[PDB]
Nucleic acid binder design. Structure first.
Ligand SMILES: [Mg+2]
Lengths: 59, 211, 158, 113, 178
RNA sequence: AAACCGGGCACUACGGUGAGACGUGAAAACACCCGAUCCCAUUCCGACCUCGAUAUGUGGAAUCGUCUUGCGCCAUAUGUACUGAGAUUGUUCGGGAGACAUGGUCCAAGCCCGGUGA
């Protein structure tokens, strides 16, 4: 690693969906390192089909 | 002639937490972080003020990490998959294995005697199914045995026939509790405790099991 | 110490040794480097696009002649970047493609939108097409690369 | 490209028959002075020698290279060889262990040609 | 519109100074000759602007109190991984760095060699177990197991799962989904 | 001690340079496996190189051996092309390829250091 050439780093914390605490490094873009929590927001998308629309409409 | 192959299962729960590192490794990593910061570019305060100027307080919820020492560790609670989180646990069942040294129960692994099945992995899966009930939270590792033992009769037990015992590996996937049946008693023990449970087979299991 | 390298040394290596036929333990594949390149049309001029590559990589890119940009991550920087990538991959169903020895991954602005450390300073990553992330393994077979990627991608929901 | 065969420098006005060559491994450092017309070792010093592998702690580092260079320079002055010529291999630069050996030989009182 | 002030701030980030200026010895003599001639570089002027209002200590660098690994209140002592008395004490200097680096190399090489020896012994016993099988079962056992790893298996981290954490998060996600 | 083994230099295309298969890490040697604090390396990166660090792990990459071969290279035809001298308008006396074809990949072998033998 060349000196005087790379950005400063920062230690932050990751919390997974089960509560496990992990320390990772990050480019220093905040004043202090912060704890970040990860949710279950997998965000699956469902579209109602034509037959399903017909069944919910006229049955 | 020589027949009755035995397939054993080394049922495994991996480490839940990372073990404590060597203090010199931690000291060097912390020094390496602090030393390289002197020669790295320090972003101005105005760029950090993009986050600081909207660093907004909330109703607030403080996070408390779970301790690495559990109540099962404090109570020495065996049959529990929640103790010795930095180590690995192994399942022993208490009953009668294939060997006929006596009619008294002894600690052992889940075995089954091979009869006609296409693979020994099928026999190990049947042996594990006969103990835990279902293979929903189990993961077998490899079609090959990890080790084997050839048991030959000696000058003091000429009644026991010759046979080979093959060990297969299986991992606990996500279940912290299992319904253990077809046995009298069971434990979840580390490598050192399993070596203490098996004082006569410790020289083989010290090599079969990586600490 | 760090969870990714410890997971590789303590879990994945022994399982790969038991699962595949290897002559010696130095034939077991691992991780060599991570290559980050931006997706093909980009401005080359704005400081926004340069700071949008410097921040997630953690090290300065090389700009050759102004037609190419590249960042190569090795060692603990590679492991740190990879565990940051793999944690955010638990939040969506990001697609990856498995090469003979490589794992190619597209780091869109949607990926930066779901990074909790990059929720703020998101004006950096707006109007940026994204980056191509190449993960190079020391595997001689595509099946070995697929097994290694399945071992590294672990989530608590399942 | 195909690498060309390495040739010794061409004779211009004088012979200069003593050539210093250095070799370094993971464990030991070596320095041989070669008499080119006879292809014989005029003088050699290494940390692998029986009389030298115990008189120094580390036999592989820059300090070992400096000690071996000083020993070789003293041995060369003992054999009445006043000057040597330096030969570097493909990977060798004037840096580190090579620099340590060359500087110790020059400091011992041997001229470099 | 698109802010030129924001682009200027990002340029200041890309050309940000360091707490201490490191010079190659070839470049250090060039800077000394420039000082003798009376010429001042822009980076030298910025470094002198830094040093007149402090220095490395004003830019978040101090030797006697190094920054710990992790965020505040979540260091290795606070998590119960390490005790306070079993931590190696050091300063941020090159003299301590040589000692820590050499000891780190020794310890890491020893641990790596122990792991590789254990894996080699296990591989040899696996080959011995394969070769001690009947022919049909040996042919069946020699096939590679290309079954992918289960994603539901975890990865060891610095802290175990909390008992009422994953269930609550999954129940909230399921209730918000329906 | 006189042989052998490892490394460095030297010799060298029959000794070069590729490919495949099989082996080999001698109580020693070489390399790798490990790290990036200082030197050094990177128009980003311990990838290369460098500096460190290895009671014994590995010969996966390279490095050593054994065979099989491909290009080459060496030796050798037989015939022909071409050609020097000479005019039976070249009836003589000489030289002699390239491409083929046949074999071989030898034999011999110096100095220093370390190890085993001693
Ligand atoms: Mg011819």
């Amino acid at each position: 690693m060349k000196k005087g050439v790379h950005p400063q780093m920062q230690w932050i914390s990751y919390v997974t969906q089960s509560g496990r605490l992990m320390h990772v490094m990050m480019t220093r873009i905040h004043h202090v390192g912060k704890v970040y929590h990860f949710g279950a927001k997998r965000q699956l998308a469902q579209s109602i089909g034509q037959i399903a629309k017909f069944k919910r409409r006229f049955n | 002639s020589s027949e009755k192959i035995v397939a054993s299962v080394l049922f495994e729960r991996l480490r839940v937490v990372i073990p404590k590192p060597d203090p010199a490794v931690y000291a060097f990593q912390e020094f390496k972080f602090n030393w390289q910061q002197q020669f790295r570019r320090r972003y101005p305060d105005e760029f950090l003020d993009i986050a600081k100027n909207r660093a907004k307080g909330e109703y607030q919820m403080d996070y408390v990490p779970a301790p690495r020492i559990t109540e099962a560790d404090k109570n020495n609670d065996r049959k529990s998959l929640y103790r010795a989180l930095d180590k690995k646990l192994y399942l022993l069942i208490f009953g009668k294995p294939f060997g006929a040294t006596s009619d008294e129960p002894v600690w052992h692994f889940p075995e089954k005697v091979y009869d006609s099945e296409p693979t020994l992995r099928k026999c190990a899966e049947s042996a594990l199914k006969s103990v835990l009930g279902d293979l929903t939270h189990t993961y077998f590792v490899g079609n090959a045995p990890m080790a084997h033992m050839a048991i030959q009769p000696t000058e003091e037990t000429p009644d026991l026939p010759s046979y080979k015992r093959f060990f297969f590996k299986c991992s606990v996937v996500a279940a912290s509790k299992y319904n253990i049946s077809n046995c009298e008693d069971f434990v979840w023990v580390t490598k050192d405790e399993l070596l203490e449970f098996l004082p006569e087979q410790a020289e083989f299991f010290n090599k079969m099991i990586i600490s | 110490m760090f969870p990714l390298n410890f997971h590789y040394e303590d879990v994945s290596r022994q399982d790969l040794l038991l699962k595949l036929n290897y002559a010696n333990v130095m034939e077991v594949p691992g991780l060599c480097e991570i290559r980050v390149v931006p997706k093909a049309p980009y401005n080359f001029i704005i400081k926004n696009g340069k700071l949008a590559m410097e921040i997630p990589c953690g090290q300065k890119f090389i700009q050759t002649q102004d037609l190419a940009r590249q960042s190569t991550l090795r060692g603990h920087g590679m492991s740190n970047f990879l565990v940051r990538i793999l944690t955010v991959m638990s939040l969506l169903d990001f697609p990856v493609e498995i090469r003979k020895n490589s794992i190619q991954f597209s780091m869109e602005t949607e990926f930066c939108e779901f990074s909790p450390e990059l929720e703020d300073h998101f004006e950096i990553f707006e109007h940026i097409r994204g980056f191509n992330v190449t993960i190079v393994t020391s595997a001689n077979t595509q099946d070995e690369t697929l097994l290694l990627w399945s071992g590294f991608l672990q989530k608590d929901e399942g | 490209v195909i690498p060309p065969a390495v040739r010794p420098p061409r004779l211009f006005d004088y012979l200069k028959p003593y050539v210093l060559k250095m070799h370094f491994t993971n464990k030991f450092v070596h320095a041989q002075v070669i008499h080119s017309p006879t292809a014989t070792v005029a003088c050699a010093a290494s940390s692998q020698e029986k009389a030298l592998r115990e008189t120094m702690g580390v036999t592989r580092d820059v300090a070992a290279a400096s000690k071996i260079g000083k020993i070789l320079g003293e041995r060369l002055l003992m054999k009445d060889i006043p000057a040597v010529a330096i030969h570097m291999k493909k990977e060798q630069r004037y840096h580190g262990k090579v620099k340590a050996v060359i500087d110790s030989v020059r400091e011992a009182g041997v001229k470099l040609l | 519109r698109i802010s030129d002030e924001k682009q200027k701030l990002y340029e200041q980030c890309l050309n940000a100074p360091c707490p201490v200026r490191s010079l190659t010895p070839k470049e250090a003599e060039r800077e000394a000759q420039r000082e003798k001639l009376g010429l001042i570089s822009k980076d030298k002027q910025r470094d002198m602007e830094i040093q007149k209002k402090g220095g490395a200590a004003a830019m978040g660098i101090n030797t006697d109190e190094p920054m710990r690994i992790g965020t505040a209140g979540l260091d290795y002592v606070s998590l119960g991984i390490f005790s306070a008395d079993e931590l190696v004490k050091y300063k941020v200097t090159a003299e301590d760095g040589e000692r820590l680096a050499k000891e780190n190399s020794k310890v890491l090489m020893r641990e790596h060699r122990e792991r590789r020896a254990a894996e080699t012994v296990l591989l040899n016993m696996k080959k011995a177990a394969i070769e001690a099988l009947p022919e049909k079962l040996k042919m069946a056992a020699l096939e590679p197991d290309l079954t992918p790893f289960p994603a539901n298996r975890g990865m060891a981290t610095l802290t175990p799962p909390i008992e009422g954490y994953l269930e609550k998060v999954m129940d909230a996600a399921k209730k918000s989904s329906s």
